[PDB]
Structures are given as structure tokens and as C-alpha cells.
UniProtKB/Swiss-Prot annotation, chain A:
Assembly: Identified in the spliceosome C complex. Associates with U4/U6-U5 tri-small nuclear ribonucleoproteins (U4/U6-U5 tri-snRNPs). Component of the minor spliceosome, which splices U12-type introns. Interacts with SKI, SMAD2,SMAD3, RBPJ, RB1, PABPN1, MAGEA1, SIRT1, FOXN3, U2AF2, DAXX and ATP1B4. Interacts with PPIL1. Interacts with VDR and RXRA; preferentially associates with VDR:RXRA heterodimers. Interacts with NCOR2. Interacts with MAML1. Interacts with NOTCH1 NICD; the interaction involves multimerized NOTCH1 NICD.
Cross-link annotation Glycyl lysine isopeptide (Lys-Gly) (interchain with G-Cter in SUMO2), location: K17, K24, K43
Function recorded in the entry: Involved in pre-mRNA splicing as component of the spliceosome. As a component of the minor spliceosome, involved in the splicing of U12-type introns in pre-mRNAs. Required for the specific splicing of CDKN1A pre-mRNA; the function probably involves the recruitment of U2AF2 to the mRNA. May recruit PPIL1 to the spliceosome. May be involved in cyclin-D1/CCND1 mRNA stability through the SNARP complex which associates with both the 3'end of the CCND1 gene and its mRNA. Involved in transcriptional regulation. (Microbial infection) Is recruited by HIV-1 Tat to Tat:P-TEFb:TAR RNA complexes and is involved in Tat transcription by recruitment of MYC, MEN1 and TRRAP to the HIV promoter.
Compartments reported by the entry: Nucleus
Protein species of origin: Homo sapiens
Signal peptide: none
From Swiss-Prot, chain C:
Disorder: Retinitis pigmentosa 13: A retinal dystrophy belonging to the group of pigmentary retinopathies. Retinitis pigmentosa is characterized by retinal pigment deposits visible on fundus examination and primary loss of rod photoreceptor cells followed by secondary loss of cone photoreceptors. Patients typically have night vision blindness and loss of midperipheral visual field. As their condition progresses, they lose their far peripheral visual field and eventually central vision as well.
Originating species: Homo sapiens
Domain notes per entry: The MPN (JAB/Mov34) domain mediates interaction with TSSC4 and SNRNP200. Has structural similarity with deubiquitinating enzymes, but lacks the residues that would bind the catalytic metal ion. Contains a region with structural similarity to reverse transcriptase, presenting the classical thumb, fingers and palm architecture, but lacks enzyme activity, since the essential metal-binding residues are not conserved.
Descriptive protein name: Pre-mRNA-processing-splicing factor 8
Tissue: Widely expressed.
Subcellular location as annotated: Nucleus; Nucleus speckle
Recorded superkingdom: Eukaryota
Swiss-Prot record, chain E:
Protein task: Involved in pre-mRNA splicing as component of the spliceosome. Component of the PRP19-CDC5L complex that forms an integral part of the spliceosome and is required for activating pre-mRNA splicing. As a component of the minor spliceosome, involved in the splicing of U12-type introns in pre-mRNAs.
Protein name: Spliceosome-associated protein CWC15 homolog
PTM sites of type Phosphothreonine: T25
Gene name for this UniProt entry: CWC15
Similarity field: Belongs to the CWC15 family.
Subunit structure: Identified in the spliceosome C complex. Component of the PRP19-CDC5L splicing complex composed of a core complex comprising a homotetramer of PRPF19, CDC5L, PLRG1 and BCAS2, and at least three less stably associated proteins CTNNBL1, CWC15 and HSPA8. Interacts directly with CTNNBL1 in the complex. Component of the minor spliceosome, which splices U12-type introns.
Residue ranges, compositional bias (Basic and acidic residues): 30-54
Cellular localisation: Nucleus
InterPro entries assigned to the protein according to its UniProt record, in alphabetical order: Cwf_Cwc_15
Top-rank taxon, per record: Eukaryota
UniProtKB/Swiss-Prot annotation, chain G:
Protein name according to UniProt: 116 kDa U5 small nuclear ribonucleoprotein component
Positions bearing Phosphothreonine: T31
Crosslink position(s): Glycyl lysine isopeptide (Lys-Gly) (interchain with G-Cter in SUMO1): K9
Organism name: Homo sapiens (Human)
Family: Belongs to the TRAFAC class translation factor GTPase superfamily. Classic translation factor GTPase family. EF-G/EF-2 subfamily.
Domain of life: Eukaryota
Record's subcellular location: Nucleus
Length: 49, 315, 56, 94, 98, 111, 43
């Protein structure tokens, strides 16, 4: 499965195994998962931008 | 189990009179006025508050394929089939500045919520990122084998995305002057893109199937299926329903958190005798989601409201 | 023609009106007999009144 | 196919694995995998082909033909368990 | 890159160097967050949709009244998708061809 | 540095019209064929040319009715591009100032 | 008793009678002037 990383490999690939074909369980209600990080993340990201 | 009691969505009002098919649609942040890009080469402005119009904008060399409303300044970003993407100043009743660098027609445009920049989906396949207020640009986004259908960006982690005709939805990380990831989920060209108010998962759609992907890290969300047709647009509202407009005229409302859509809407908006296959090219949800602006190739913008009924069936 | 004209009072330019260019200030402003002249134009229309023909 | 006709065939088989890591398309992956397994690497080619076919989606004619070729190869013992797993993945009357 | 900067051209001169922030008189983001615009638009459309309101010479003729009582047959305001004739190109071609 | 206006804006509108028509034409059939879609741009293109430009319906026997209806829709949109613009040309001729010969008598001949 | 010479009918009544409760609004005349382009009179 690591053969798909041949060539340039740094950070974002996120396709190797086929386990990502079907999603995980179903839609659920969670604050960190289903919404977003805190406002300080958008503030520091906006300042970095 | 189809929870959260999806309410039925119905019509509100009918509008017509445009000289050509409506390519794009946009609304003011305070719901004061509306605007629509049209095939007639003149930028349309319609104030819908009473069912009225707004103003007739002119000077676009070709049909406007997109428009945007800046929150900070009264300048509506303009994009059209003329390959000239020009943000317009409306303060003087005349434009702001004309952006440059697009090699071909601009299929889309977007505005960053925090930083000042101009995003564009250019049929050259080039998605233009522009440092804007300075008259500057920012960076050129490439890598799509075919033309970029859609563009989306946010002030969160580098979520940037451009829907591409090449069947691989593009993901750009702009912060580094870079990209993000290649999305192979869509089996065909994705002409639809949406950003849900949940903000956790980026939404997209294609005629083959609709692809919803939970981001930032490269994770996905779900595969929306059951509507087979060319997908003109996808719009996610705050109530949990996302209307999907099609070129065939079938708008399918979406229950999302339930795992499947909230409605299959088949209706005839057909104008007088000229009809052919023209469907609804674009649609927009209101601020309070009390109505839905319907822009169709028949030059009829029809808002959609509900009758406040119980209903709530299942399947 | 007044009974055939569906309005109690308001009368637009109707059939014949807006004579300006050459006698700009020497033309007529308006009169009740001018509305009677428009009703006379309707009396010329209905006076001819072909079923199917190209008319005035 | 042009690289397969060469006398090396090592870079052609490794290129076939590179196509397996590339878009499988469920056509050239099973067909090219059957060509490589038919060329050489019986136990290995059927192992990687069974792991790949058991990874992304099941099959019908490719799965039944793969279990038939793996059964007629040497023994049907492993092909019986593989047939029970493939049949259990997509049950049906056929 | 660190290259491809040599000469300039027109239309590239410094322009709009100072942007314009949203004034509190036009659009305030906090006022939009606290906005009543749902009920404000329901009441606006409630008012607008609430009130909308607004004799031998004659005998010697060989014919009689022919066209009478026909007015609304031609729609005053009609938006037609067909651009061939409709209302517009009917009078447009009528004035440009005779 | 494109879109020179004059008569060049129409060529970019026809090329861009044939651009999205190729993507939607490729999205019309779920599988179909690859090279078969390229030749359809000639039949639909010229069929719309002689279709709208002439009085012939340009009906193709055994045609892909969804693709012929989409190309007929967008073809009628192209006719509208030559309709309202021609109405503006007649307004720019009589009322407006005349420009040269070619464009003038051209649009007059289209009308 | 049949139709009109110059007027007659070409696909009429379709959009007007389509929606039973639908109200169509088409303004081809003015739709506000260019004096005030929805700006802020901060003068």
C-alpha cells in the first residue's frame, strides 16, 4: 500500500487503503467534529494570512 | 431514520422580464437588494423585497457568469463570459477596478471572508487568486486538467477548493502560495459546490453523484445519491436542507444530517412558448431561509416559500 | 363614442393628438371639443370599420 | 502492453503495480493483473490481486473468474474460503 | 520565481490604495447578526402585498361596427421567452418594415 | 489580452459557447464513448448554424434527443445573442450614429 | 370569430395561467433611476 507514495510525498495524500470508500457510521451531533475549532483559530489563521 | 422533522418547502413568488437566461444570482447581506447575472450581456439587479427590481447594470462585454457582494465595501465583484473579471464600485454608480491575468473566460468567482482577495474559476483551467484592493493579484492556481467549474475559500484552515471539469475536485492551500489535495471521489465533472453552515464538511456535486467531503485534513463526509441528471447548482441552507438545481429543471431539496435529501422537486417553471430543455441554472437561499431565489435559463427568478404544514412523511 | 369610451373623465392622446413642430406655440392646448374630436376619430374608425383589413 | 513486449518485463510488471497504485478503473487493474499473474508469480499475483479486489469494492465476473482461476491453479481449499468471503460480501442467488 | 519583473504598462498604476470599510449607516455586521430581517421582511412584504389596488350619414354606410370591445386581447405587460416576435419584435419589426 | 470587442467579442462568445457545450456534452452520457463526443460538436454546431440561420428545422434522424434538446436550447440562446444585439444595432443605426459599412449593412441584412 | 390578422396568437396564456396562486412580476421599463445606486448619503 505504500507504493502509492512513490515520487514526491510530503503531507496531503489521504488515499492509500480503500477504507475511505464508504464513510464512517452516519451523521452525528458533536461540537468539535460537526462545527469548527474556536475563534482563536480563525483569528490566528486570519493574522497568518 | 430521517430525523429532525424536515419541513416541506414550497413556492413564494414568480419573476420574469429578463432579456436572457440568468447565469448567476446574488443577494445583499441585509436583504436590501438582489442581483443576477444574465445571458443578455448586461448585469441584472433586482430588488426582491416587495417583489420589485433594483437597477440595470451595463458595460459587460459578454454574459456575466458570476457576481459577489463585498461586505466591507459596496463593490460587487463581476465575472463574465468576456474573460474580464471586474469588481464594480456601486458608490459612484460605477465600477471599482478591473482585475487582469485571466487567460480565458471566468467560470466562477469568490471573495475571502477575512482577507481581501478575488477568487476566480477560469475556463483556461486557471483559478485566479488575487490580492485585490491594491490592484495586485495573489497567486495563480493550476493543476486541473480541464476547466474549473467552481471556486470556494474560507478564513479557516486551508480549505480552498475549485470544482474542476476534469472530474477531480481541486483542493488548494493558498496560505503557502500552494495547494491542498486532489479529490478523486467524483466520477464525473463536478459542476456543483456548496459550503454548509455546519462548516465542518465542504459540499460538492456532480451529474454522476454528489460528493460531500468532511475537511480540513483530507477526510470526507458522505456520498449524496439518488438524483440522476446534470447538476446545475447545490446550495446548503441553515435549516439542514440543500436545494440542488439541475439543467433539466428538477430541483431536489436535501435533508443532509439525516443522510439523505429532504425532497425531490419536479416542477415546470417554463416561460412562454420558448421552453426546450431549459432548467434552473442557479438558486440562492435567503438570510432567514424564508424564500429561495430561483434563477432559470427561461429568465424567470421565482422565490420559494412554504405553507407551514405538518406533513413530514418518510420512505 | 363617449358611451363607447370606457372612462368617465380622463382622456389620453387617443387617436389624434400631439401636433407641435411647425405651430409650436400657435397650436391648441386642449378642449372638451378636442375630446369630441378624438371621439370623432373613433367615429371615423367605426365609420369605416372593416372586419379583417389593415386599418389606420 | 508496449513495455510488456520488451525483454525486460520487470519494469513492465512494476509499472503494472504502479498502475494498481494509480486509478484501478476496475478494468485495466483486473485485466492487467490477470495478464501479469498469467505471465508469472502465480501465488504472488493471485495474492495481490485478491488483496486489491478485496480492498476497493467487490466484483462479479472478475471475482468469479479470479476464484475459478485460483481454484484450477493448484487447490480449491483456499478458493473455497475466498469464495465464501466474496459470496458473503455480496450475497445473491447466483 | 524571483524574476519576471522588468517593465510596467498602463492600467497597472496604483489605484484604489485605500479600501472602504462598511459604515454603521449602511451595513453593520453586528446589526446584521442581531437583525430582525426575518420579521422585517415578513412585515415589508405584508404591507406591499397588503395594499395593491390601482343620423342618415351613419345609416348610409354599407358596413357596421366591426372591431369593438377588443382591447385586452393584446397583453399590456407580458414577458415572453420567445425573442422572435412576442410584443417587442412585433412593433420593432412593424416600425422597421413597411 | 483577449476580448478586443469590435467583431471579436462574437467569436469569443461562440468559442466559449462551444466550450461548456463540450463539458456538458461529455456529461450527457454516463459512459458512451470518448471519440464519439468530439464529432458531435460538428453536427450540433453546424446544425445549429444552418438551423437558426435558415428556415430548415435541421432535424437529425435517430439523434440523441437529450443532447439535441440541450444544444437546441443553447442554440436558441445563441439566436437570442443575435436577436437583442441586432435590436441594439438597429437602434444604433437609425437613432444612433452609423459606423462604416460592413457592420451597418450586415446587421441590416440580418434584420 | 377565429383569430386576428396581425395579432392572432403565438403560444400565449401559458405563463399567466401556469401558477394558480403564482404572481408574475416583470418590469421592463425603468426599475429605479441611476441617481441613487443604493449608496449612503453621507454628504
Amino acid at each position: 500500500d505504500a507504493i502509492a507514495r512513490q515520487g514526491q510525498s510530503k503531507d496531503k495524500v489521504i488515499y492509500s487503503k480503500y477504507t475511505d470508500l464508504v464513510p464512517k457510521e452516519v451523521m452525528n451531533a458533536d461540537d468539535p467534529d460537526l462545527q469548527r475549532p474556536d475563534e482563536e483559530a480563525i483569528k490566528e489563521i486570519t493574522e497568518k494570512t | 431514520p430521517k430525523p429532525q422533522w424536515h419541513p416541506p418547502w414550497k413556492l413564494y413568488r414568480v419573476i420574469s422580464g429578463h432579456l436572457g437566461w440568468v447565469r448567476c444570482i446574488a443577494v445583499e447581506p441585509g436583504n436590501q437588494w438582489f442581483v443576477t447575472g444574465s445571458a443578455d450581456r448586461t448585469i441584472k439587479i433586482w430588488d426582491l423585497a416587495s417583489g420589485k427590481l433594483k437597477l440595470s447594470l451595463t458595460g459587460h462585454i459578454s454574459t456575466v457568469r458570476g457576481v459577489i457582494v463585498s461586505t466591507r465595501s459596496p463593490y460587487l465583484f463581476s465575472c463574465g463570459e468576456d474573460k474580464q473579471v471586474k469588481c464594480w464600485d456601486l458608490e459612484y454608480n460605477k465600477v471599482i477596478r478591473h482585475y487582469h491575468g485571466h487567460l480565458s473566460a471566468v467560470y466562477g468567482l469568490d471573495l475571502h471572508p477575512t482577507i481581501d482577495v478575488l477568487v476566480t474559476c477560469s475556463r483556461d483551467s486557471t483559478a485566479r487568486i488575487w490580492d485585490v484592493r491594491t490592484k495586485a493579484s495573489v497567486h495563480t492556481l493550476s493543476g486541473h486538467t480541464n476547466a474549473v467549474a467552481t471556486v470556494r475559500c474560507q478564513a479557516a484552515e486551508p480549505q480552498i477548493i475549485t470544482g474542476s471539469h476534469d472530474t477531480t475536485i481541486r483542493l488548494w492551500d493558498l496560505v503557502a502560495g500552494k495547494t491542498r489535495v486532489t479529490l478523486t471521489n467524483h466520477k464525473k465533472s463536478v459542476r456543483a459546490v456548496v459550503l454548509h453552515p455546519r462548516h465542518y464538511t465542504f459540499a460538492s456535486g456532480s451529474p454522476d453523484n454528489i460528493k460531500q467531503w468532511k475537511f480540513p485534513d483530507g477526510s470526507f463526509i458522505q456520498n449524496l445519491s439518488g438524483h440522476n441528471a446534470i447538476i446545475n447548482t447545490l446550495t446548503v441552507n441553515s435549516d439542514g436542507v440543500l436545494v440542488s438545481g439541475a439543467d433539466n429543471g428538477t430541483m431536489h431539496l436535501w435533508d443532509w444530517r439525516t443522510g439523505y435529501n429532504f425532497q425531490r422537486v419536479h416542477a415546470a417553471a417554463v416561460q412562454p412558448g420558448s421552453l426546450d430543455e431549459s432548467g434552473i441554472f442557479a438558486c440562492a437561499f435567503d438570510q432567514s431561509e424564508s424564500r429561495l431565489l430561483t434563477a432559470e435559463a427561461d429568465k424567470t427568478i421565482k422565490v420559494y416559500r412554504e405553507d407551514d404544514d405538518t406533513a413530514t412523511e418518510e420512505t | 363614442y363617449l358611451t363607447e369610451h370606457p372612462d368617465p373623465n380622463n382622456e389620453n392622446i387617443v387617436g389624434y393628438n400631439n401636433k407641435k413642430c411647425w405651430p409650436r406655440d400657435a397650436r391648441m392646448r386642449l378642449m372638451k371639443h378636442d375630446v369630441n374630436l378624438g371621439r370623432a376619430v373613433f367615429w371615423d374608425i367605426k365609420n369605416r370599420l372593416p372586419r379583417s383589413v389593415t386599418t389606420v | 502492453e508496449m513495455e510488456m513486449k520488451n525483454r525486460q518485463v520487470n519494469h513492465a510488471r512494476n509499472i503494472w503495480d504502479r498502475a494498481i497504485t494509480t486509478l484501478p478503473r476496475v478494468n485495466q487493474f483486473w485485466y492487467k493483473y490477470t495478464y501479469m499473474e498469467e505471465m508469472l508469480g502465480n501465488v504472488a499475483g493471485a495474492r495481490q490481486v485478491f488483496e486489491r479486489w478485496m480492498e476497493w469494492q467487490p466484483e462479479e465476473q472478475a471475482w468469479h473468474s479470479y476464484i475459478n482461476f485460483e481454484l484450477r491453479y493448484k487447490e480449491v481449499d483456499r478458493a473455497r474460503t475466498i469464495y465464501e468471503r466474496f459470496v458473503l460480501v455480496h450475497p445473491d442467488v447466483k | 520565481l524571483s524574476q519576471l519583473s522588468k517593465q510596467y504598462s498602463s492600467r497597472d498604476l496604483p489605484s484604489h490604495t485605500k479600501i472602504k470599510y462598511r459604515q454603521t449607516t449602511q451595513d453593520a455586521p453586528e446589526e446584521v447578526r442581531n437583525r430582525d430581517f426575518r420579521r422585517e421582511l415578513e412585515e415589508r412584504e405584508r404591507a406591499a402585498a397588503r395594499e395593491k389596488n390601482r343620423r342618415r350619414w351613419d345609416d348610409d354606410v354599407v358596413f357596421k361596427n366591426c372591431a369593438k370591445g377588443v382591447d385586452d386581447q393584446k397583453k399590456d405587460k407580458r414577458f415572453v421567452n420567445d425573442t422572435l416576435r412576442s410584443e417587442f419584435h412585433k412593433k420593432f419589426m412593424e416600425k422597421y418594415i413597411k | 489580452a483577449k476580448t478586443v470587442t469590435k467583431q471579436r467579442v462574437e467569436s469569443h462568445f461562440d468559442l466559449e459557447l462551444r466550450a461548456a457545450v463540450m463539458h456538458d456534452i461529455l456529461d450527457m452520457m454516463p459512459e458512451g464513448i470518448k471519440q464519439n463526443k468530439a464529432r458531435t460538436i460538428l453536427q450540433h454546431l453546424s446544425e445549429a448554424w444552418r438551423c437558426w440561420k435558415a428556415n430548415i428545422p435541421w432535424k437529425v434522424p435517430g439523434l440523441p434527443t437529450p443532447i439535441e434538446n440541450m444544444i437546441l436550447r443553447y442554440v436558441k440562446a445563441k439566436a437570442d445573442w443575435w436577436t437583442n444585439t441586432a435590436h441594439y444595432n438597429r437602434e444604433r443605426i437609425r437613432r444612433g450614429a452609423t459606423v462604416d459599412k460592413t457592420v451597418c449593412k450586415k446587421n441590416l441584412g440580418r434584420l | 370569430e377565429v383569430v386576428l390578422h396581425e395579432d392572432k396568437k403565438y403560444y400565449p396564456t401559458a405563463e399567466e395561467v401556469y401558477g394558480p396562486e403564482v404572481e408574475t412580476i416583470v418590469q421592463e421599463e425603468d426599475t429605479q433611476p441611476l441617481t441613487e445606486p443604493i449608496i449612503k448619503p453621507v454628504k
